[PDB]
Every structure is written in structure tokens, then in C-alpha cells.
With several copies, the nearest count.
Chain A
Amino acid sequence: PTMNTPGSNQFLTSDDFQSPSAMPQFDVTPEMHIPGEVRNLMEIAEVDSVMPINNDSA
């Protein structure tokens, strides 16, 4: 058991770890409620939209 196993030194994009913070003092702006919130992209995929049917050249 060790902490230097293969692939422990490397930067892999799309790999999540914690990171130190530039400012560990300031960080404070209270969130407020804002009307309308999207949390999934199927909440804008079920909205109607007018499709173009007629295609000529102009």
C-alpha cells in the first residue's frame, strides 16, 4: 500500500480533486432567489419551437 502508485503524478483533464483557494477570506456574497431555474437540460428540450418546413433557396 503506497501513495506513489502508477498514475499518481499527472494532470488528467476531467478528473476532480480539491484545490487550495486563492482567497480563503473573501468569498461572501449571499445568494438570493431568482425566478426560473434550470437544473437539467431536458427542461428546455420539452419546450415547443416552430420548425421550418419550407426550404427553397431564399
Chain B
Amino acid sequence: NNHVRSESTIENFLARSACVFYLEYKTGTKEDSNSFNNWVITTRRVAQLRRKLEMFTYLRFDMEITVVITSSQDQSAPVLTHQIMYVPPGGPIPVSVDDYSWQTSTNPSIFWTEGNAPARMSIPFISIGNAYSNFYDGWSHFSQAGVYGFTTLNNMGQLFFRHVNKPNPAAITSVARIYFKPKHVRAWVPRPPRLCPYINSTNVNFEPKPVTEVRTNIIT
């Protein structure tokens, strides 16, 4: 080298795209069991991602969500249009393919057609708190008897997906895979790295593990 480093900035230690989920849904009537599908935004799903966001106790960031979507027919039509709807937390949600929760005016939605560069949009920092909390040590209720940890803290919206075309002969099944990255990170208060494999996706519960590998003898 010849100057101060800049590959170990907080902004470059984070802010890398990663797969976080994928899901399926297929053309069909509202009767059909799977014909819309949803994913709740959380960063605790993927172990690798989770590790690097438990380096810090508090974070605030905007995030970008890009969905890349493919489709294939199955054994024996016009180009399909897909709708991706973001529901901010505390909004209405659909329970079926046809509802007035897809017609609601306060839920952002992206209409996108195949053969175009994949849809994306950013979601700005949302929370009444001044940072997301990656550790919490309280209860939901005002007397201790609530739910321990991750209560109303770390609550973000959720996506929904459906086809926008009418059903037509021959089912089409789509697979949409979600990529996620934060941007404009700021971190406050560091933590020691996690040492034990994750168990639950909502608790810090762990099974005891050895600190380190054995050696053949301490002397050289």
C-alpha cells in the first residue's frame, strides 16, 4: 500500500447483493390453492447475511429490492404481466387472488412485462425508531409477560405477487427470485461475532459449542 485502506469501510463491508428468497405461483383462478404468493421482508432468513448484520447493535439504511423472474409452461399465448405489490407495515393484505387489497391506492405496485430488464425499486428507511434493533431485551407488554425479543422492533412490510392476465388454457408457472442489498448504512455499537449455529429465526437460542479446535500439544 501507500495510503489508508478503504476496502474495510462500513459501506463496503455491507451493501452487496444477495439472494434471500424465491417462491413460485402460477396462473389460475381464485379457487386454486397457489396462484399468488408472498414473502415477508426479513434479513434473518439467510445465515450468511445474518452473520454480518449481527456485527452491530443498531443500523439504519435504505434498501433496494430487485426481483428477477423467469417462467415456464408445462405440458399440453400473449406475453404475461406480473404485479409486485409492496404493502407498508400496518396496511391491508390480500387473502385471495381477487380482493380490493390489490386495488388499494396506498400500496406501491410495479407492473412489469417479460423481456425487459428486471424490476426494482428502493424502499426508504421506515420505522418510528431512529434505528433498527438487532438485539432487544424487553417484552411486548408494559408488564413483563409479553414476547421476549424482536417484538414490534424490526418490522418491515411484505411483498405479494400475482399474474395480471386472465387464466387461459395451459398453466404457466413462474419462479421469482429476490435480491436484496442495503445502501447508505450507518452502524453504531459493535458486537462480538456469533459463534454457534442459528436455530430459530426469531430467537437468539443456541446450543453450546467448543470455543476452538484441539491441538496436539501446546508446546512446539
A residues near B, CB below 8 A?
A: 4-15, 19-23, 25-32, 34-44, 52-57
B residues near A, CB below 8 A?
A: 1-2, 5-10, 12-13, 16-17, 56, 58, 60, 64, 66, 68, 86, 88, 108-112, 116-131, 179, 186-190, 211-215, 218
CB within 8 A of A39: which of B2, B10, B122, B123?
A: B10
20 additional contacts, CB 8 Å, given A12-B110, A14-B17?
A: A4-B117, A9-B112, A10-B118, A11-B66, A11-B118, A13-B108, A14-B108, A22-B122, A23-B126, A28-B1, A28-B6, A29-B128, A35-B189, A37-B187, A38-B187, A39-B10, A40-B8, A41-B8, A42-B8, A54-B218
Contact between A7 and B108 (Cβ–Cβ < 8 Å)? no
Contact between B188 and A36 (Cβ–Cβ < 8 Å)? yes
CB within 8 A of A37: which of B16, B109, B123, B188?
A: B188
- The verdict on A6 contacting B188 (CB below 8 Å), with A28-B7, A30-B1 known, is no
Contact between B117 and A6 (Cβ–Cβ < 8 Å)? yes
12 A-B Cβ contacts within 8 A?
A: A6-B117, A11-B111, A13-B108, A14-B17, A21-B122, A23-B126, A27-B124, A29-B127, A34-B130, A38-B189, A41-B9, A43-B190
A19 to chain B, nearest CB (A): 5
Contact between B117 and A34 (Cβ–Cβ < 8 Å)? no
Across the interface, which residues of B come within 8 angstroms of A6, CB to CB? Answer: 66, 117-118, 120
Across the interface, name the chain A residue whose C-beta is closest to B56: A38
Contact between B117 and A8 (Cβ–Cβ < 8 Å)? yes
Across the interface, which residues of A come within 8 angstroms of B131, CB to CB? Answer: 34
Contact between A52 and B212 (Cβ–Cβ < 8 Å)? yes
Contact between A31 and B60 (Cβ–Cβ < 8 Å)? yes
